Amino acid sequence: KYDVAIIGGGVIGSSVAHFLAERGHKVAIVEKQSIASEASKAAAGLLGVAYNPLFELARESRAIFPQLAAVLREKTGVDIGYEEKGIYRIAQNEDEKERILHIMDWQQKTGEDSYFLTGDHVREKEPYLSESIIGAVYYPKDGHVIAPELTKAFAHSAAISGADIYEQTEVFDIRIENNKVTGVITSEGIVTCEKVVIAGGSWSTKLLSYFHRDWGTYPVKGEVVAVRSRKQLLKAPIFQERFYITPKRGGRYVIGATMKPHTFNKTVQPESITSILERAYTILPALKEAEWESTWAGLRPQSNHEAPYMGEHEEIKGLYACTGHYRNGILLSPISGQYMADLIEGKQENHLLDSLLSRRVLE
Amino acid sequence: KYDVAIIGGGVIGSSVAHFLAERGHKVAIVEKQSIASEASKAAAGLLGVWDAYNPLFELARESRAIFPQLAAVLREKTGVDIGYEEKGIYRIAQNEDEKERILHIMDWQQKTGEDSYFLTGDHVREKEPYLSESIIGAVYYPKDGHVIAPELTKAFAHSAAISGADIYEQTEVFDIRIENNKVTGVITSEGIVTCEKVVIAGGSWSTKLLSYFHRDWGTYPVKGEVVAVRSRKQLLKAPIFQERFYITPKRGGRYVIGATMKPHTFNKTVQPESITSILERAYTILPALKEAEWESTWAGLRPQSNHEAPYMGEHEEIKGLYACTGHYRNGILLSPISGQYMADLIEGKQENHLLDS
Ligand SMILES: Cc1cc2nc3c(=O)[nH]c(=O)nc-3n(C[C@H](O)[C@H](O)[C@H](O)COP(=O)(O)OP(=O)(O)OC[C@H]3O[C@@H](n4cnc5c(N)ncnc54)[C@H](O)[C@@H]3O)c2cc1C
Ligand SMILES: Cc1cc2nc3c(=O)[nH]c(=O)nc-3n(C[C@H](O)[C@H](O)[C@H](O)COP(=O)(O)OP(=O)(O)OC[C@H]3O[C@@H](n4cnc5c(N)ncnc54)[C@H](O)[C@@H]3O)c2cc1C
Numbered sequence A: 001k002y003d004v005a006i007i008g009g010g011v012i013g014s015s016v017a018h019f020l021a022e023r024g025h026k027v028a029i030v031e032k033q034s035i036a037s038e039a040s041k042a043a044a045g046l047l048g049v050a051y052n053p054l055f056e057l058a059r060e061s062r063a064i065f066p067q068l069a070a071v072l073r074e075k076t077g078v079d080i081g082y083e084e085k086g087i088y089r090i091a092q093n094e095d096e097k098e099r100i101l102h103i104m105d106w107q108q109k110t111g112e113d114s115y116f117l118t119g120d121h122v123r124e125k126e127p128y129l130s131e132s133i134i135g136a137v138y139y140p141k142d143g144h145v146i147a148p149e150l151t152k153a154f155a156h157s158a159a160i161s162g163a164d165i166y167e168q169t170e171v172f173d174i175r176i177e178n179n180k181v182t183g184v185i186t187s188e189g190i191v192t193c194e195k196v197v198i199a200g201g202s203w204s205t206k207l208l209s210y211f212h213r214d215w216g217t218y219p220v221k222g223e224v225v226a227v228r229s230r231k232q233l234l235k236a237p238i239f240q241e242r243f244y245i246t247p248k249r250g251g252r253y254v255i256g257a258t259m260k261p262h263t264f265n266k267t268v269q270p271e272s273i274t275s276i277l278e279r280a281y282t283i284l285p286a287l288k289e290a291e292w293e294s295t296w297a298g299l300r301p302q303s304n305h306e307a308p309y310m311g312e313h314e315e316i317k318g319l320y321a322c323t324g325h326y327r328n329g330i331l332l333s334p335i336s337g338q339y340m341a342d343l344i345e346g347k348q349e350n351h352l353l354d355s356l357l358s359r360r361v362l363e
Numbered sequence B: 001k002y003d004v005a006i007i008g009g010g011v012i013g014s015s016v017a018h019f020l021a022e023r024g025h026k027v028a029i030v031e032k033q034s035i036a037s038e039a040s041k042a043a044a045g046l047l048g049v050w051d052a053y054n055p056l057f058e059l060a061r062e063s064r065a066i067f068p069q070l071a072a073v074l075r076e077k078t079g080v081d082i083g084y085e086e087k088g089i090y091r092i093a094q095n096e097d098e099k100e101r102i103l104h105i106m107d108w109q110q111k112t113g114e115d116s117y118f119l120t121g122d123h124v125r126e127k128e129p130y131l132s133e134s135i136i137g138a139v140y141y142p143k144d145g146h147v148i149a150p151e152l153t154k155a156f157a158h159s160a161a162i163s164g165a166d167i168y169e170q171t172e173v174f175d176i177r178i179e180n181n182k183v184t185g186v187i188t189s190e191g192i193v194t195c196e197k198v199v200i201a202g203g204s205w206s207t208k209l210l211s212y213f214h215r216d217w218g219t220y221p222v223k224g225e226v227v228a229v230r231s232r233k234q235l236l237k238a239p240i241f242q243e244r245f246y247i248t249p250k251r252g253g254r255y256v257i258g259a260t261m262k263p264h265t266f267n268k269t270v271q272p273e274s275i276t277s278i279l280e281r282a283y284t285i286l287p288a289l290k291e292a293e294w295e296s297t298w299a300g301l302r303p304q305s306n307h308e309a310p311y312m313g314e315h316e317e318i319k320g321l322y323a324c325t326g327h328y329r330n331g332i333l334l335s336p337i338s339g340q341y342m343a344d345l346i347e348g349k350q351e352n353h354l355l356d357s
Helices: A011-022 A053-062 A065-076 A094-108 A119-125 A147-160 A270-283 A285-289 A333-344 A352-357 B011-021 B055-078 B096-107 B121-127 B149-162 B272-285 B287-291 B335-346
Strands: A002-007 A027-030 A087-091 A115-118 A135-139 A164-166 A171-176 A181-186 A189-198 A217-228 A238-240 A243-248 A252-256 A291-303 A309-312 A319-323 B004-007 B027-031 B089-093 B117-120 B137-141 B166-169 B173-179 B182-188 B192-194 B198-200 B219-230 B240-242 B245-250 B254-258 B293-305 B311-314 B321-325
Touching: A002 A011, A002 A181, A011 A027, A011 A147, A011 A319, A011 A333, A027 A147, A027 A189, A053 A333, A053 A352, A065 A147, A087 A094, A094 A115, A094 A135, A115 A119, A119 A135, A147 A164, A147 A333, A189 A333, A217 A270, A243 A270, A252 A270, A270 A285, A309 A333, A309 A352, A319 A333, B004 B011, B004 B182, B011 B027, B011 B149, B011 B321, B011 B335, B027 B149, B055 B149, B055 B335, B089 B096, B096 B117, B096 B137, B117 B121, B121 B137, B149 B166, B149 B335, B219 B272, B245 B272, B254 B272, B272 B287, B311 B335, B321 B335
Parallel strands: A002 A027, A002 A189, A027 A164, A087 A238, A189 A319, B004 B027, B004 B198, B027 B166, B089 B240, B198 B321
Antiparallel strands: A087 A135, A115 A135, A171 A181, A181 A189, A217 A252, A217 A291, A238 A243, A243 A252, A309 A319, B089 B137, B117 B137, B173 B182, B182 B192, B219 B254, B219 B293, B240 B245, B245 B254, B311 B321
8 A cells, every 4th residue: 555656667757756755755657568678778868968848857856866866875785877078969061050159159058058169179179070070069968868777776776765666567557446547457457546646657658548548658769889999089979860879887979869750660761770870970080990889779759649647637636647758857857856745745746737838829 | 099998898807897987998898799698697686685795795895885985976977877776684583493503693793794683483473574473583784785786787787888988799819819928919719808907707608718727726606596586576675585595676566586506507497496496485585476477597606716706806917818707606796896906906906815815
C-alpha cells in the first residue's frame, strides 16, 4: 500500500521517485522492462539548446544539476557524468552563420553569456574540427550528463530511501473506485496506492485518456552512432542544426541523430548510419579512423500538445501526469521531479497544465 | 621516440603511465588486447583486507592515503569515477573458532590498526539486517574500503592520454631492443616502438621479459572465478570478508561474490562447481541472494610471482630496464604507490630497495 505508484522507470519517473522518496513518501516504480530501457538510455544528455515558458523551466532545471550530481554520487555511488565545458554551435556556410548570429543576439538579452567565435578561433580551442567551419557560438555555461547514469542514479536513490522498484511489470490500467485512485492494474497483479503518476514516455497515450482522448504522446525514433578514439578529438560537444557530436567519459564520441516520427521501431537502417557518419566527417574528419563501437535507436516522447503534461487531474483525485518532454526530458528531469513532488505535497498549485499546454494563436 | 614504453595496460601499467605522463614524460602504453582486459577488470577492488616488517605493509599504508584525493583528481581530470567507497569492511565469523582467530587478528594487529573494533552478531544485524543469524560477530574496519578496479584502470590510462600518452592497444611486445647495453625500444607485433626506458607490467604474462633480470624470476596466473547478482533490496552497505571469501556491494544494486583459486592456468572459462560452491557459501552469509537476479560470472588470472612477491625496481647492469609486475591479490590496493614508486625511481628520486627485500 503506497503513497504514489509511478508508471514508468525512465528518467522522468525515476526523477519523480527520487524527490518524493527523499521527502519520506512510500513510492513504487512500475516499469514494463527495466530502469532506463527506452528514451532515457538513448539520449545524448545535452543540457541547454526560440523563447517560451519552457526556456525558464529549463533555466531553473539547468541550475539544479551541479548540486544534484554531488548528492547522487554521495548517496548511490553512481556518478552521472555531469560536465560543464561549454557547447559550440557551428556553421560551415553563411546562411548558417547568420542563423546562429540571430539566435545568439536574442539569447544575449536574457542574461545568458555566449561569445561568437571565428573558424580559426574555434580551431585554436578544438583543433580536430574541420577547416570548413567559418564561425560558431560558444556557450561556456552549457554542459551534459550521461542520461542512463542519471536515470539509474535517481532510481537507486529512491530505492535507498525506501522506494520499491517493480521491473518487468506492465500497467494495463489505473483502478479508480469512487472517483479516487485506489491502485494500479499490472501484469503481475494489483498494486495498491493512493496516488498515481503517469511517466510512460512514448507509451503514455492510453493512460492519458482519463484526462482527455486527445491528450497523448507518440514516439519520434532517433538513431545514433558511437565511436571510441585514443585521441583528444573534442573537449566539448558541438551542435549543428540539431545534429551533434559529443564526447563522453572514456574516449567515447556519440553522434546523432535522425528523426523518424510515429514508429516504435528500434532497429537501425544502414542509410541512417551512412547519413550520420558522412555528416560527422564534414565537421570532424578524424572520426574516419576512430573505432566503431555501437549504434542504437531511441524513442523520443513527443507530446500531442507540443509540451509535456505535468499536473493533477481536476476531478479524479491522486491522478497525476508527467510525460511528453520530447527532446528535452534529460535537461528538464530535475525541475520535473521537484515540481511533481511539490504538487503532490500541496506545496505548489496545478498551474503547469495551464502554462505549458495553452498557446494564444491570435490577437 | 618515447621517454618510456610501458608493457602492460593493466592497473599497474596504467598507474605508472599516469604518474609519469603527469610529470611531463612522453609515455607509450603497449597492450596485447585492450586496457584493463585481464586481472584488473576481474578484481573485486578491495583495499587492505603480510608480517609487520614486510615493506609492502608501509607501501599498502601509503597507497590507501593517496587514494581519496587521487579519486577526486581522476574524476575531475578524466570524468571517470573510480567508485572509491570508504564505508568499512566486516571480517565475519560463523564458528566460535573463527571468532577467536578474528579477535586474534584484531588484538595483535593494532599497529595503529585502522581503529577497528569487535561487534556482536546481534549488533552487526542492527547495522546490516540481511546478514545471517549464523554470524556470531566480526571485526569492523571503519577506514577500510574498495574501488571499481576496471574503472580505476581506465581512469589512470585516460589521465595519461590526456597528458599526451599514446595507447597502443592490440599490440604484443615480443622482445626489448637492447643496443650497446642500453634500451632503444620494444619489438612488437605492429612495428618497432622507439623508447629510452621500458617497464615490464605484463601481469601473469611477464615471465619471458623478466628473464632479462634472472631466469629464476617469473610470474604465473592463479585463476579466480567470481559471480555477480543484482538486487532491488539493500542487502549490504559495506563488503563482508571471511578467510579470502567476499561479498561486496557495488554502485547500482550489484553484488559481486568470490573468489575461487586455481593455480597455474590461464584458462578463463568458469566451472559450474565453482558457481555452485561460491553461491552456496554466499547463501549461509546472506540468504536473500537466493532471490536476487543472476547477472554474470567470470574468471581472472591473479599474477603470482615465482618469489611470492612483486618485482619492482631497476636492472642494475642494463640501462633503463624496469619491472613492476606480480602483485598477486593486492594489485588494486598497490596501484597508486606502485605507480608513484615507479615514477620516483625512473626520475632518480627513489633508491632501489624492493628488489633487495
Ligand atoms: C536520440 C535521442 C537523443 C536525445 N538527446 C537528448 C539530449 O541531448 N538532451 C535531452 O534533454 N534529451 C534528449 N533526449 C530525450 C530524452 O530521451 C527524453 O525526452 C526522456 O528520456 C523522456 O524520459 P521518459 O522517462 O519520459 O521516457 P522513457 O525513458 O521512454 O521512459 C518511459 C518508461 O515508461 C515505461 N512504460 C511505458 N508504459 C508503461 C506501462 N504501461 N507500465 C509500466 N511501464 C511503462 C517504459 O518501459 C519506459 O522505460 C533524446 C532522445 C533521443 C531518442
Ligand atoms: C578474482 C580476483 C579478485 C581480486 N581482488 C582483488 C582485491 O579485492 N583487491 C586487490 O587489491 N586486488 C585484487 N586482485 C588483484 C588484481 O586483480 C591484480 O593484482 C591487478 O590486476 C594488477 O595486475 P596487473 O595490472 O599487473 O595485471 P593485468 O591486469 O593482468 O595486467 C597485465 C596486462 O599486461 C598485458 N600484457 C601481457 N603481456 C603483454 C605483452 N607482451 N605486450 C603487451 N601487453 C601485455 C595483458 O594483456 C594485461 O592487460 C584480484 C584479482 C582477481 C583475479
